[PDB]
Amino acid sequence: KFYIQEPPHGSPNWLKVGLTLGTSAFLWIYLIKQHNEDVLEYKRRNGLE
Amino acid sequence: MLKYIIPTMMLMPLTWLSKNSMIWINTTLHSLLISLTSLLLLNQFGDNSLNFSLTFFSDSLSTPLLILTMWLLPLMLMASQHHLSKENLARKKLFISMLILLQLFLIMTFTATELIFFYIMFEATLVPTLIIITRWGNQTERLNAGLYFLFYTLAGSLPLLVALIYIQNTMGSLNFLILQYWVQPMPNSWSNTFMWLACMMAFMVKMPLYGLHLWLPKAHVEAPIAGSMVLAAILLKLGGYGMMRITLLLNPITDFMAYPFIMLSLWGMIMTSSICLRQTDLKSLIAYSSVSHMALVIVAILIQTPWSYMGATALMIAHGLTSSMLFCLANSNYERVHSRTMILARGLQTLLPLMAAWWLLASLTNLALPPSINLIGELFVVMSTFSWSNITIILMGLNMVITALYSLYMLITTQRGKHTHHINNILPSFTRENALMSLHMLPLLLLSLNPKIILGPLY
Amino acid sequence: LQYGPLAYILGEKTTKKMTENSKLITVDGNICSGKSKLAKEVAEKLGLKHFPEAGIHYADSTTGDGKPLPVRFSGNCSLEKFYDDPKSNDGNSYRLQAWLYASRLLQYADALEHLLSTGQGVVLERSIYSDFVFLEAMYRQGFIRKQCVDHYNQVKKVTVCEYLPPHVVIYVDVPVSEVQSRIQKKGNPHEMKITSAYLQDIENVYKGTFLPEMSEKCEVLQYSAWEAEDAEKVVEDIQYLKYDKGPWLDQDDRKLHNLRMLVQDKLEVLNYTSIPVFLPEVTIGAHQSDRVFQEFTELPGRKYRAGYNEDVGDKWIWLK
Amino acid sequence: ARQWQPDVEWAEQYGGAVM
Amino acid sequence: MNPIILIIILMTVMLGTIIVMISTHWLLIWIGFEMNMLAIIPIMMKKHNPRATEASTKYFLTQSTASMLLMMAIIINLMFSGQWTVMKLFNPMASMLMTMALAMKLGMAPFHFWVPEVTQGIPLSSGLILLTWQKLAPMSVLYQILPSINLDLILTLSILSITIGGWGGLNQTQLRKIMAYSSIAHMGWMTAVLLYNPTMTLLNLIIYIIMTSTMFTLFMANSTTTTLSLSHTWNKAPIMTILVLITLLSMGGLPPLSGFMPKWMIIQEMTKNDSIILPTLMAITALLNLYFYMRLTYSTALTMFPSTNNMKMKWQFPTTKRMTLLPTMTVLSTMLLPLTPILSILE
Amino acid sequence: RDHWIHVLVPVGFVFGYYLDRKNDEKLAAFRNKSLLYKRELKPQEEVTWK
Amino acid sequence: LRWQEDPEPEDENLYEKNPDSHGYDKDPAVDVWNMRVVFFFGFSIVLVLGSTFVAYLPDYRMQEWARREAERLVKYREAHGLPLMESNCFDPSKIQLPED
Amino acid sequence: MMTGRQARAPLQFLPDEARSLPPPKLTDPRLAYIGFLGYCSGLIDNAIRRRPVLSAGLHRQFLYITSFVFVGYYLLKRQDYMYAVRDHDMFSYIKSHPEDFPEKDKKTYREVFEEFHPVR
Ligand SMILES: CCCCCCCCCCCCCCCCCC(=O)OC[C@H](COP(=O)([O-])OC[C@H](O)COP(=O)([O-])OC[C@H](COC(=O)CCCCCCCCCCCCCCCCC)OC(=O)CCCCCCCCCCCCCCCCC)OC(=O)CCCCCCCCCCCCCCCCC
Ligand SMILES: CCCCCCCCCCCCCCCCCC(=O)OC[C@H](COP(=O)([O-])OCC[N+](C)(C)C)OC(=O)CCCCCCCCCCCCCCCCC
Ligand SMILES: CCCCCCCCCCCCCCCCCC(=O)OC[C@H](COP(=O)([O-])OCC[N+](C)(C)C)OC(=O)CCCCCCCCCCCCCCCCC
Ligand SMILES: CCCCCCCCCCCCCCCCCC(=O)OC[C@H](COP(=O)(O)OCCN)OC(=O)CCCCCCCCCCCCCCCCC
Ligand SMILES: Nc1ncnc2c1ncn2[C@@H]1O[C@H](COP(=O)(O)O)[C@@H](O)[C@H]1O
């Protein structure tokens, strides 16, 4: 070891890393789904397809 | 202008990701590459300005100011790397980032097509300048000087904000290209009187106007060398640029509103020049000379003739190069003797002959020696003010005596006579210092060969 | 963190883990009272965690690699130079005493943190309730100034009020003659320069101020130097104490939760140790502070937060 | 020669009950 | 305090503000203000010293006086309209009494005289609640009664708040009184544009809450209540000096920062309505707020005041304080001006 | 790349230059439509300027 | 006495440890590469090629054209007996006047 | 100002007619600026806890960027919607009140007389 006391952020909180990447991936796929649904709805409502 | 904004922004990761021995050399190299690219702004036309987008444009007024702005950053990096050699690495990077951020505010100050974006960048230029003066200035008075520099500018400019939004509501736009074609005559009233004052007093503070100039021999004296270079070379010229943009909207009331201010400048350039005869602080002598030279630009804008605008933009570019070189020379002595007192270190031509040649050339361009662009701007403002009134030549010519007298006395006190005996740390001139002097002076003398690029929108 | 309001909500009460053995015992005495074995002896009779007396490098022991730092980074003060020149011009006396008060405050925070997180009692040596006895003994000898006493009383007034006193104070009656006898038998060339009036002032502030004010807020046990040799008598006296005084009686889960939240945040413990009173014995100017701080950042394992140092071999930093 | 940084006399001006 | 009791009391503070925001009956408005005060009193008495009891007593007396004047305005509205809808008032006397009551609840001048005391008497987190969350309910009631608010009264309150909050902070060394006089000046700015465009009132309120929450979060993260203890921050944590630098330059309304965003827009909505002297004198008086912000930036970031020796111990510990949303609030209080036309989401 | 930092400013130039050209196609309302410069399209040509 | 302060450091001489110092840095390789970067990208690139660029600008603000165009117009109206410049810039037929 | 327009359908963040509008692109410069604000928030979060600023917590920095882009996309949709409602109500009011908005005769400068003011 190097430290006399174990640091609380020595090893990664793998639950927190998994929640972070899962929430981030979910937000990106929901954002792309929202944007594709919005461009489809725009092209539907304005008759430009 | 986005081909100049994005490289200036990419100087931020260029200076924060460099190796610790490399953060000066990389920024100097790539800022010189940006300044080399700055010549593509010279695509100027006899009828139209170079109108890039809805946000950015450049005529022949902003183009020399932009080339001077993008040229001054490498010279500031060269000037400010010796006295910040012992500095912490992160504070050194923060200093370079403040200079980069100031250049980034300046290049879209001069190219703002719309006047409230001009105001936002024009007042965004306070924050890096204020931080540089109050953080890397040397003496105690830098905090007070930062307060004066801040609260003269904002007290002048917050009326300008209300005035510009009023023009926005009345005319519908603050596009300078639209307001070239929708400008209405501004009739005589008290409403239009305080309209004129709210449009003009912020730039009167920035020039500075005599009587409002009290921020300048503190803020240009209590600053580090890069701060003094950018203040006296660019930041005094925001006022002249703003007046040349804003007096379009202020006609015909300017034709009698200018009469007090012209007096304040025509007498002011007599007084401040005379102050340079009796200054002990060399940096303050260069500061009051800056007030004296910018008084002519105030007069030339307020008489609004073509010869006056040509001479005023020539004199702004020429004074930028000359006063920046003079501050760098005063720093070249101050890094050796650690005092700004001019009578302290005398007879320096006996010790530094090539640097005394640089002092000689800077003082000859200071006294407007022909055919330097200093003399071209000086002479054209004299021609236009002679056409304004045939008596003003007296106040011009007496100024042109005193402008000689402090320019050579500064040369005689610092460089001539018997040297000071007890001072023995006068090192030979480093290659960096003479490089800085030559990068100030050789563009200034080459512009005498082709002055038409620094003569503005109505050449 | 590890402990917070959520752990208190989710059932972690500290009176659950608070047995009869959970006693905070501070062992006090003069410079060579020999109490340090006695304290350890009590900690090996009752199963208590012993804490040694905090020197200059206690905070160095708790942080980083646990090894002592150089003296310019921690302390900026020498005990041996106080032993040599107590009236020294550089202000080393009160600077050493203020750093020792900060080190004992950090030690007392670690003591309460152990006692409230584990329920194991802690033996201390000369806690923050018995630090001023050196300060007054310096001031009665003209070693510090009255401004140093006022600064110490300010820092003590805003720091010791936040905590609870010990359960048991053990004092060791040693005369000045036996102290100097054990100093001359010790062999430290600096510590033999301690005057007799200094030790006499230490013992007078002990017997005159410290124990008369601690007999109300806790239980004093005052032994002589020969009967402190028998540990089992002292431990048998401790095991038959009827705790009836001091604010350890009125401690529910809420107050001890607040105290445990205090003692686990070390910068809030050490908050008002550096109050901006500009006293020349402790004021460090800007250039020296900048120089020593930038040097402290370059120590190994000290540039970042503890789990974020490549140079001492921390892994997975991009996922932390 | 080095940069002026505030002394005790400068700092105590900001440490009163009122400015 | 018990954490469960703390959570229930803070949800009751929020519930009082929500019942003010969402209700259509004046009795429920008064009930939401009563619930808000009744729950926020223990948040102010969190540490149990005589200063918090004095601050809570002064806060109780001013808010109770405002609640009684509010109910008298409601009762006079019931006289002259026979109904209870939260809308314009049907009597200028009821309008004046409700404007006085809400100016007391906001602590606008000349009813400002409780704000720098109470903020000094309470901790930094409860001062954060008082200077951010306790503005939302009275500004909502002012948002809904602006057809009946007298112009001269609310503009007199606005300019008197801006001038008194300007001159008040110039003599201060305590950070909580500085934030309180900053609060008074900013509430003057918010109500000066209320009858002209209430969207810019909502803009100024949101930008103010972001900047105030940033400054109180920095003060809690460094445990600093005076100027002279904030001046030790460069030797403890040099990033926090840059953060208080950019946030204090933003609260002064210096462009290109986000706190230039409201007041500029306020001027942009006061010149459309042909008022030129009034936003000019308001903007000139804002230089006073800028001046004591610059005083704090000189004491903290741009110079280095001398530290003590015990700071070397605090170098060996990192800040374990939960700095909740502090990078987010630092970014959103400085770099938000290029997104200035986002304000239409408040329309 | 051993000298990846010496392309931050030139690529930031070119990209910026690129965006300037990309802005010109958004300001192509009056391309070949001004009274001064309107003319017939020469063969093998679709726009007058890009 | 006064507080714990570092004494005033001396001003350094870059020529003592390095007699070939160009003034840029105390590391000599860094110093010489800083010199070469400043002199190449400042003088060899910006000054020389910049003066070449300014010297060969494509008729900066179209003055030369305006000479040659003037050389057209005079040559058109030396022949036709027309005056070389009218005093009226705009045709008076296409100007309505305010009557009185 | 528009408080009566968004009162028949209260507390709708994006109404249904907002779907008739083209959404902001995922390469919107405003949205990329909000992503840059998220990246700066990640850097300040590494700086205040004394982490390596560019290296530590790439999941955390990426969630900062993701959260600001995600919130800012809806904020830009609402911004574009409210300026669209602003112009729609403007144009319907101009169409519904021609007595207040006359078509003004644009005179040419051959008839327009302006006073000349000489600079001398
Ligand atoms: C487009 C291509 C253009 C090519 C041609 C270049 C055009 C002019 C550029 C600048 C020329 C002067 C540069 C040297 C002066 C600064 C350094 C210095 O003092 O060195 C002394 C040193 C020799 O002295 P040393 O013994 O070794 O040590 C010095 C002693 O310790 C102590 O030294 P000292 O006191 O014994 O000696 C200093 C002495 C002191 O003498 C004076 O101070 C008296 C000067 C004023 C009265 C006389 C002139 C009055 C005006 C008439 C002349 C212009 C118009 C003529 C046309 C007819 C009339 C219209 O001055 C001189 O010897 C220089 C003579 C020329 C002076 C020019 C006027 C400066 C006065 C202030 C401004 C007035 C308006 C300027 C208009 C410029 C028009 C281009 O010279 C060198 O080592 C020369 C280095 C290389 C110079 C390169 C110049 C060009 C750089 C441009 C690069 C980029 C473009 C590419 C072209 C490259 C061409 C090669
Ligand atoms: C450097 C420090 C000094 C700075 C001086 C700055 C300029 C000096 C004068 C400023 C006056 C205020 C701004 C005027 C803006 C005019 C815009 C406009 O629409 O004008 C026409 C309008 C006219 O109103 P209107 O246009 O709405 O009316 C419709 C048109 N008519 C008139 C036909 C009915 O002017 C005004 O409304 C008032 C103008 C004067 C305002 C006087 C109040 C300010 C007092 C002086 C402040 C001086 C600086 C303060 C700081 C000093 C140092 C701390
Ligand atoms: C510009 C605003 C910002 C200012 C600072 C900018 C700094 C950054 C640097 C940018 C690049 C450089 C900018 C300035 C360039 C100016 C130079 C330039 O382009 O010149 C064009 C001028 C152009 O003149 P021209 O207009 O006649 O050129 C004709 C045009 N062409 C070439 C297309 C046919 O160049 C010359 O005049 C060159 C002539 C030959 C070289 C000089 C010979 C004479 C020298 C003196 C001889 C001795 C005489 C007696 C004196 C004795 C001693 C006292
Ligand atoms: C039209 C608009 C309608 C309304 C829109 C929404 C408006 C939202 C306004 C939010 C105001 C928040 C006020 C502060 C949070 C409330 C609770 C609180 O004060 O928590 C602080 C908490 C107390 O912990 P404690 O232990 O007591 O701290 C002392 C330390 N011994 O913990 C601490 O002390 C730790 C330090 C950090 C706490 C900072 C919390 C900041 C949260 C708010 C962020 C800003 C608001 C959101 C963004 C703008 C939205 C408009
Ligand atoms: N003012 C002081 N003078 C001498 N020693 C002190 C003082 N304050 C604390 N001490 C400590 O008390 C110790 C004496 O007890 P001991 O541990 O038995 O040597 C010293 O070695 C110091 O570590």
Short mmCIF file of C-alpha atoms in Angstrom, two decimals, chain E residues 109 156 158-168 184-185 281 285 288-289:
data_model
loop_
_atom_site.label_atom_id
_atom_site.label_comp_id
_atom_site.label_asym_id
_atom_site.label_seq_id
_atom_site.Cartn_x
_atom_site.Cartn_y
_atom_site.Cartn_z
CA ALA E 109 -36.78 48.96 1.18
CA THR E 156 -40.71 53.93 -5.41
CA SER E 158 -37.93 49.49 -6.52
CA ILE E 159 -35.65 52.54 -6.63
CA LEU E 160 -35.51 52.78 -2.85
CA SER E 161 -34.53 49.11 -2.69
CA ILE E 162 -31.83 49.55 -5.35
CA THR E 163 -30.33 52.65 -3.70
CA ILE E 164 -30.47 51.30 -0.13
CA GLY E 165 -29.13 47.89 -1.15
CA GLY E 166 -26.37 49.74 -2.97
CA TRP E 167 -25.25 51.95 -0.09
CA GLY E 168 -25.79 49.28 2.55
CA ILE E 184 -32.42 44.18 -1.46
CA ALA E 185 -30.89 45.75 -4.58
CA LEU E 281 -30.32 55.85 -12.62
CA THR E 285 -26.83 52.80 -8.79
CA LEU E 288 -22.39 50.42 -5.88
CA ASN E 289 -23.25 46.72 -5.74
#
